[PDB]
Design an enzyme around this catalytic site. Sequence first.
Site, short mmCIF file in Angstrom:
data_model
loop_
_atom_site.label_atom_id
_atom_site.label_comp_id
_atom_site.label_asym_id
_atom_site.label_seq_id
_atom_site.Cartn_x
_atom_site.Cartn_y
_atom_site.Cartn_z
N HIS A 53 0.78 -1.24 0.00
CA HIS A 53 -0.08 0.21 -0.08
C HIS A 53 0.66 0.89 0.34
CE1 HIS A 53 -2.37 -2.79 2.20
NE2 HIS A 53 -3.41 -2.98 1.23
N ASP A 56 2.37 2.06 3.28
CA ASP A 56 3.05 1.34 4.50
C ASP A 56 4.54 1.49 3.91
OD1 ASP A 56 0.84 -1.14 4.90
OD2 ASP A 56 1.67 -2.20 2.55
N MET A 87 2.37 -5.71 -7.60
CA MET A 87 1.12 -5.17 -7.66
C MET A 87 1.48 -4.67 -6.50
SD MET A 87 -1.39 -5.54 -5.28
CE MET A 87 -1.68 -6.69 -4.18
N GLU A 180 -10.44 -6.81 -5.05
CA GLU A 180 -10.69 -7.17 -4.35
C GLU A 180 -12.03 -7.39 -3.61
OE1 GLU A 180 -7.98 -8.99 -0.37
OE2 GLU A 180 -7.28 -7.42 -1.93
N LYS A 182 -14.58 -8.96 -0.62
CA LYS A 182 -14.80 -9.17 1.15
C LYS A 182 -16.27 -8.91 1.86
CE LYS A 182 -12.32 -8.62 5.51
NZ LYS A 182 -11.35 -7.92 6.31
N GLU A 216 -9.60 -13.41 -3.00
CA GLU A 216 -9.19 -13.88 -1.43
C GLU A 216 -9.54 -14.94 -1.01
OE1 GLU A 216 -7.56 -10.83 1.54
OE2 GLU A 216 -7.72 -12.71 3.20
N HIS A 219 -11.85 -14.50 2.16
CA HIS A 219 -12.86 -13.91 2.44
C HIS A 219 -14.19 -14.08 1.61
CE1 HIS A 219 -10.47 -9.64 1.80
NE2 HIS A 219 -10.03 -10.06 2.94
N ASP A 244 -5.22 -13.45 -3.71
CA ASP A 244 -4.78 -13.81 -2.51
C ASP A 244 -4.75 -15.32 -2.01
OD1 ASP A 244 -3.75 -11.02 -2.44
OD2 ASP A 244 -5.54 -10.52 -0.57
N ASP A 254 -11.85 -12.24 10.35
CA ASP A 254 -11.11 -12.45 9.13
C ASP A 254 -9.65 -12.96 9.63
OD1 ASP A 254 -10.06 -12.77 6.38
OD2 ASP A 254 -9.18 -10.24 6.18
N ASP A 256 -6.69 -14.58 7.99
CA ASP A 256 -5.25 -14.35 7.71
C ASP A 256 -4.33 -15.06 7.97
OD1 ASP A 256 -7.14 -12.29 5.38
OD2 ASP A 256 -5.67 -10.63 6.84
N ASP A 286 -1.71 -13.57 1.45
CA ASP A 286 -1.82 -11.42 1.88
C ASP A 286 -2.46 -12.56 3.58
OD1 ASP A 286 -3.22 -9.74 2.80
OD2 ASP A 286 -4.94 -9.65 2.30
O1 GLC Z 1 -6.01 -4.95 -1.44
C1 GLC Z 1 -5.16 -4.51 -0.74
C2 GLC Z 1 -4.86 -5.42 0.81
O2 GLC Z 1 -5.68 -4.08 1.64
C3 GLC Z 1 -5.80 -4.56 2.71
O3 GLC Z 1 -4.38 -4.93 4.01
C4 GLC Z 1 -6.98 -6.20 3.02
O4 GLC Z 1 -6.69 -6.39 4.66
C5 GLC Z 1 -6.13 -7.05 1.97
O5 GLC Z 1 -7.49 -8.03 1.83
C6 GLC Z 1 -5.65 -6.91 0.14
O6 GLC Z 1 -5.81 -7.36 -0.22
CO CO Z 2 -8.43 -11.55 4.73
MG MG Z 3 -6.31 -9.24 0.68
#
Ligand code: GLC
Ligand code: CO
Ligand code: MG
Length: 387
Positions: A53, A56, A87, A180, A182, A216, A219, A244, A254, A256, A286
């Site tokens: 992200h 991050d 990605m 994505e 959820k 995912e 999810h 994912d 969730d 993970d 993920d």
């Molecule tokens: O979309 C990028 C990521 O963002 C967040 O960290 C979500 O928890 C994850 O599910 C997703 O893949």
């Molecule tokens: Co998740």
């Molecule tokens: Mg994810």
Amino acid sequence: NYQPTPEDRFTFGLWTVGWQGRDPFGDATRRALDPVESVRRLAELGAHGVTFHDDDLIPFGSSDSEREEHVKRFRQALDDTGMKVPMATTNLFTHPVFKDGGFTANDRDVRRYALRKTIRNIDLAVELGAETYVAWGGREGAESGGAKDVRDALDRMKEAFDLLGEYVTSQGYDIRFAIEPKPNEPRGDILLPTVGHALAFIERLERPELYGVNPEVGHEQMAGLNFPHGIAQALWAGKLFHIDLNGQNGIKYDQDLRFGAGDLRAAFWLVDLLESAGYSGPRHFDFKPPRTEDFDGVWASAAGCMRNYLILKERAAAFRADPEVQEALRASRLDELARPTAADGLQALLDDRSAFEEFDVDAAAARGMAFERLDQLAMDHLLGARG
Ligand SMILES: OC[C@H]1O[C@H](O)[C@H](O)[C@@H](O)[C@@H]1O
Ligand SMILES: [Co+2]
Ligand SMILES: [Mg+2]
């Protein structure tokens, strides 16, 4: 045994191994990781690449000068190790300003900010070599029925994705978008809650070819759905741009977990499907190392993700290569499923008395499908009680 190498295309988000362990009821149990250390440690484990992200990599609110220094350090680590960035994505969920969403916030000024924040990170992602740009609308939704007009929200979501598509095409970027899904968490209900809803939504965008799904494991399982079936539908539609991988024990928060944990037989059928269909994208993990773990357990958990994929891949290949399994597949008429129902055409089918008037319904109903013998062979191959 089962040593991962970069050819296996395993990737990890910075936020995965770097999760400090803060959950809704407890403080962090681990110190923050330097993204540079994560890149080097993952390279040593055999990973192919990393994802991120915006937030991050660059702390939120950073000046343009701080931002450049964060990006330079990171690129140097990538240059030193040969690690790829296949990605990237935007954080449109952590900061309080997104508490009602980004693209579908009720407040218009927040929606415009969401779009500008995203576009800025698309530029960086393309610079670093990303092929796929993921959108997870974790805050797009509601806890109560009157808070969100869902038709208007879908108009605003279509608007946002259409603008992003106009932007990448106007810039000549070679990047595609992956939504994505959820079903819930952190909102009571999240818009586009499953692979199906996301696939249907993409078909209403102005440039559908630019958009696919990033499903995912956990999810779809939060809705009690069959994850391999949903992947099969995404592949059938030509829309599986990214994936994912993780684990989830049923319908709950969730989790993970590391890939392979959770529903193990679903993981086997998933790997069987990805490999037999020739999926060529990244195998992205993920996952969150549980907050019980110290930093040694973090890397053990990351290593376990790749190990479990490689074991399941070996077992699924053995399963499909077994002549006794091939015989069982014919016994269950999997091969007749591949034959067209009525390639002779509609009129021929209407005039075929063997298809209705003279169809012996009782003889057909009496045939066993032999599915249980086939499934026990699959079990024996998963458990290595045969090869
Ligand atoms: O979309 C990028 C990521 O963002 C967040 O960290 C979500 O928890 C994850 O599910 C997703 O893949
Ligand atoms: Co998740
Ligand atoms: Mg994810």
